[PDB]
Design an enzyme around this catalytic site. Sequence first.
Site, short mmCIF file in Angstrom:
data_model
loop_
_atom_site.label_atom_id
_atom_site.label_comp_id
_atom_site.label_asym_id
_atom_site.label_seq_id
_atom_site.Cartn_x
_atom_site.Cartn_y
_atom_site.Cartn_z
N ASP A 131 0.89 -1.18 0.00
CA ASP A 131 0.00 0.00 0.00
C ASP A 131 0.89 1.18 0.00
OD1 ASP A 131 -2.00 2.25 1.30
OD2 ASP A 131 -3.08 0.41 1.74
N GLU A 135 0.33 8.36 3.12
CA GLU A 135 0.44 8.33 4.52
C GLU A 135 1.03 7.08 4.88
OE1 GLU A 135 -4.02 8.73 4.33
OE2 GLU A 135 -2.41 8.73 2.54
N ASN A 136 1.72 6.45 3.96
CA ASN A 136 2.60 5.29 4.41
C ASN A 136 3.96 5.48 3.94
OD1 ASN A 136 0.75 3.37 5.83
ND2 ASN A 136 0.25 2.61 3.76
#
EC number: 2.7.11.1
Length: 249
Positions: A131, A135-136
């Site tokens: 993913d 925000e990763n």
Amino acid sequence: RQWALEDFEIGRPLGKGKFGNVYLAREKQSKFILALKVLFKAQLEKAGVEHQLRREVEIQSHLRHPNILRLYGYFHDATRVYLILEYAPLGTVYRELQKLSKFDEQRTATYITELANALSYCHSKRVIHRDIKPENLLLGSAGELKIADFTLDYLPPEMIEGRMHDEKVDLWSLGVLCYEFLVGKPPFEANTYQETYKRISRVEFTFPDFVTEGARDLISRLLKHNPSQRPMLREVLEHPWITANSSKP
Ligand SMILES: O=C(Nc1ccc(Nc2ccnc3[nH]c(=O)c4ccccc4c23)cc1)c1ccccc1
């Protein structure tokens, strides 16, 4: 080695997740700054995810790359799990975005580049379908990119369209990202989840008129429906838009 809450003094929160919170923290013994991430066996169970964990932990534990966030240790007690991790001082690419609303092409190109290498090594060792939402992505003390992953818009046509994916998936994400960086939002946003299905199966998107050819070229090759048509990494790395821009110290 053996870890224990007691070998860590605990700092300030840096985020509250679904199963728990990540904190700043230091190893009482070396004074080593890092991040701690706290799970509750409890909520883990009820979402029966302990399976998803114990795997990725393992996995992670092994990996070592400058652009991927490190997982040092993991330890447990009564009722929560602890995960020791690298600290990324500069925070997430997601706030960086919210803040500049948009990235210029040098920044983007460079971030892509990191990703790409990361993604490559991660692949090499046979691991995929990260993913990689913004925000990763965290940021290193150098603004060096780095990644940490453990909806939707970033899924590709072959996954939503319940079909057969491989590591080309990783090429699509990379398109979305590169699009999102430059423009600010991801190229298939939409209000309901079912517009987004639609948008993605027809790969239906459009550039704002501020986006250079270089970029639209690259982006386009990555966002192709037929997995097979999309480049591969060292191609991407070898794309010109990239070489022209990629600040690479
Ligand atoms: O829980 C896990 N991942 C993960 C990834 C990132 C973070 N949080 C941070 C870690 C290090 N530096 C950080 N810096 C930050 O600035 C930050 C801000 C918000 C949320 C988290 C962080 C963060 C916490 C946990 C995990 C699980 C399995 C395998 C690997 C990682």
